Amino acid sequence: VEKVFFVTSPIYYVNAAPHIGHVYSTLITDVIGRYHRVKGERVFALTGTDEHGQKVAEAAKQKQVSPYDFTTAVAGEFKKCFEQMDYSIDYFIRTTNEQHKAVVKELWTKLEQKGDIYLGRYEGWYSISDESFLTPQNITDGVDKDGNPCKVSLESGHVVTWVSEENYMFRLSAFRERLLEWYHANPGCIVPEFRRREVIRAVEKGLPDLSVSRARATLHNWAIPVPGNPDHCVYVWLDALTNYLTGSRLRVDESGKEVSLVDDFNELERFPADVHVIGKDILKFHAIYWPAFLLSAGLPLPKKIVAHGWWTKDVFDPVEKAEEFGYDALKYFLLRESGFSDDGDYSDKNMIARLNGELADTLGNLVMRCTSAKINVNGEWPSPAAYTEEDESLIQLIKDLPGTADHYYLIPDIQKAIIAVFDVLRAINAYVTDMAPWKLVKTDPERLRTVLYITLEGVRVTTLLLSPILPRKSVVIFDMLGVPEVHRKGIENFEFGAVPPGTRLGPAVEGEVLFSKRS
Numbered sequence: 001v002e003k004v005f006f007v008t009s010p011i012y013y014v015n016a017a018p019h020i021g022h023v024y025s026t027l028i029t030d031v032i033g034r035y036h037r038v039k040g041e042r043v044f045a046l047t048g049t050d051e052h053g054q055k056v057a058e059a060a061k062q063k064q065v066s067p068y069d070f071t072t073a074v075a076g077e078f079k080k081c082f083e084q085m086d087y088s089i090d091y092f093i094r095t096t097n098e099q100h101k102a103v104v105k106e107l108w109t110k111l112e113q114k115g116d117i118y119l120g121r122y123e124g125w126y127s128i129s130d131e132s133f134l135t136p137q138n139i140t141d142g143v144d145k146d147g148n149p150c151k152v153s154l155e156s157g158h159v160v161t162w163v164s165e166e167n168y169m170f171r172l173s174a175f176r177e178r179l180l181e182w183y184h185a186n187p188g189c190i191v192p193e194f195r196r197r198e199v200i201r202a203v204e205k206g207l208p209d210l211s212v213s214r215a216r217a218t219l220h221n222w223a224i225p226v227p228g229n230p231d232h233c234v235y236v237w238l239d240a241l242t243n244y245l246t247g248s249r250l251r252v253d254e255s256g257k258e259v260s261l262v263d264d265f266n267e268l269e270r271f272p273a274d275v276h277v278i279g280k281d282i283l284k285f286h287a288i289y290w291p292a293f294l295l296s297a298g299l300p301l302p303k304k305i306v307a308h309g310w311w312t313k314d315v316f317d318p319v320e321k322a323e324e325f326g327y328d329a330l331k332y333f334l335l336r337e338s339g340f341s342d343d344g345d346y347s348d349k350n351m352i353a354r355l356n357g358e359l360a361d362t363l364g365n366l367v368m369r370c371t372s373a374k375i376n377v378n379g380e381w382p383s384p385a386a387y388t389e390e391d392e393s394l395i396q397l398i399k400d401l402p403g404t405a406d407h408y409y410l411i412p413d414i415q416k417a418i419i420a421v422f423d424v425l426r427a428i429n430a431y432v433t434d435m436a437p438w439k440l441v442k443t444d445p446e447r448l449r450t451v452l453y454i455t456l457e458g459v460r461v462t463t464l465l466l467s468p469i470l471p472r473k474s475v476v477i478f479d480m481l482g483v484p485e486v487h488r489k490g491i492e493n494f495e496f497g498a499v500p501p502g503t504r505l506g507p508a509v510e511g512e513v514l515f516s517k518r519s
C-alpha cells in the first residue's frame with residue numbers, strides 16, 4: 001500500500017499547562033514521523049489538545065474563567081511549547097474545532113445506525129481526572145484534598161465518584177471475540193509485548209458495555225451534543241479518540257491551518273494510523289474502545305499502538321532544560337534513557353554523563369577528527385586504496401547498520417535504534433584509535449586515504465540514521481562533512497559509498513563545539 005504514513009500522539013487535556021510528558025509523547029511521534037521522511041516516505045504527523053469534558057470544564061471553573069477562554073489560552077500555551085521544542089508536526093488539532101465536531105456526530109450516527117448504541121444506565125465508579133469508568137475491583141481507599149476518607153482509583157490514585165445516570169451505551173461486549181481475533185492475527189499491533197499481553201488478558205476476562213453519553217448538566221454543558229438528543233453530551237473519550245479520524249480528513253494550509261474537511265478518509269490516504277503513540281495510562285481507550293468503535297463503524301483499524309513508560313498526563317521544565325543543555329541533546333537524552341519502563345535516571349548528573357560521554361566524546365570527537373586540518377589536510381573525501389580485513393570489518397558494520405536501525409525504528413523502539421547507531425560509533429572510534437590517522441599523515445599517505453574515507457562514511461551513515469533524533473545537529477554535521485543535500489535523505493543514501501570521493505568539506509568555523517562538554 002502506497003499511503004501517507006500516519007503517526008499520531010495523544011491529544012492532551014488542557015486542564016493545566018504543558019509539561020514534560022506531553023513533550024515526551026509528542027517527541028516520540030515527531031521522531032517516528034521524521035525517520036519516515038528521511039526514507040523519502042509521505043508523512044502526516046498529528047498532535048493536539050483534548051478540550052471538552054468535565055475534567056477541563058471544572059478546571060476552567062476553578063480558575064474563574066469561561067471554558068472557551070480557558071481552552072483557547074492553554075491550547076495556545078501547548079502550541080507555543082511545541083514550537084519552541086522544534087518539532088515537525090504536520091498539524092495541531094483541537095477538539096473544539098468545528099470540523100472535528102462534525103466527524104464525531106458522523107461517527108456517532110454510524111454506530112447508532114449499525115445497532116451498537118442503546119439507551120441504558122451506568123451505575124458505578126468514575127474518575128473525573130482520568131475521564132474513566134472503573135469497576136469496584138479497580139478502586140481502593142484514599143483521601144481527598146483534605147485528609148478525609150474517600151475512594152481512589154487503583155489506576156491513578158485520583159479521587160473517584162459514584163455515578164448513576166441514564167446514558168447511551170455502546171455495545172462493547174459484542175466486540176470481545178472480534179478484538180481477540182485482531183490481537184492474535186496481528187501480534188505486532190500493540191508494543192511493547194507485555195502491554196500487548198495485558199490487553200489480551202483483560203479482553204479475555206470479558207467486556208462490559210461502555211457509556212458513551214452523559215447527562216448535559218454533569219459536564220457543565222462543555223461537550224458535543226448527542227445527535228438527536230440534546231439532553232446528552234458525547235462521552236469525552238469517544239469525542240477524543242475521533243481526533244485521529246478527523247485529522248486524517250483535514251486538508252491543511254501552508255501555515256498549519258485547517259482549510260477543508262473531506263468526505264471520505266481515502267481521499268487523503270492517511271487513515272488508519274500506522275502508529276498511535278500513547279502513554280501506558282491510556283491503553284484501554286486505544287487498544288479496546290477505539291478498535292471496537294472502528295469495527296462497528298466499518299472503518300479500518302490502526303496498524304500499531306505503542307505505549308511508552310511515562311504517565312501521559314501525570315522537577316523538569318522541558319524548555320528551560322533545553323536552553324541549558326541544548327535542544328537536540330535534551331531530545332537525545334530523553335530518547336536514550338527511557339525504555340518502556342519509565343525507570344530512567346533523569347538527574348542532571350546523568351544528563352551530563354550522556355552529553356559528555358556519548359554526544360561529545362563518541363560522536364562529537366569523531367566528527368572533529370575526520371574533518372580537522374591536522375588529519376584531513378586536503379579538506380575533502382579521499383579515494384580509498386585497498387581495504388584490509390580490519391577495514392572490511394568496520395565497513396561491514398556500517399553496511400549492516402541501516403537495516404538494523406530500520407527494524408528498530410519500525411517496531412518502534414527508538415532507544416534500541418540509538419544504541420545500535422552508537423555501537424557503530426564506538427567501533428569507528430576504536431578503529432581510528434587503532435589506526436592513528438594522525439601519525440599516518442607523515443608515514444603513509446595512501447593508507448590514510450583509506451582510514452579517512454571509511455571514517456567519513458561511517459560518520460555520515462550514523463549521522464543520517466541519527467537525524468530524526470538530532471535534527472539540527474545532523475545538519476551541522478553534514479555541513480561539516482560537505483554532504484550535498486540530496487544525499488541527506490532517501491534510502492538510496494543508506495548505502496555505503498553514496499558520497500563520492502573528491503567532495504569538499506564545508507568551511508570551518510573554528511569556534512567549534514558540536515557538543516561542548518559540561519560541569
Ligand code: MET
Pocket residue numbers: 009010011012013050240241242243282312313
Ligand atoms: C485520544 S487521546 C486522549 C488523551 C487524554 N486527553 C489525556 O490527556 O490523557
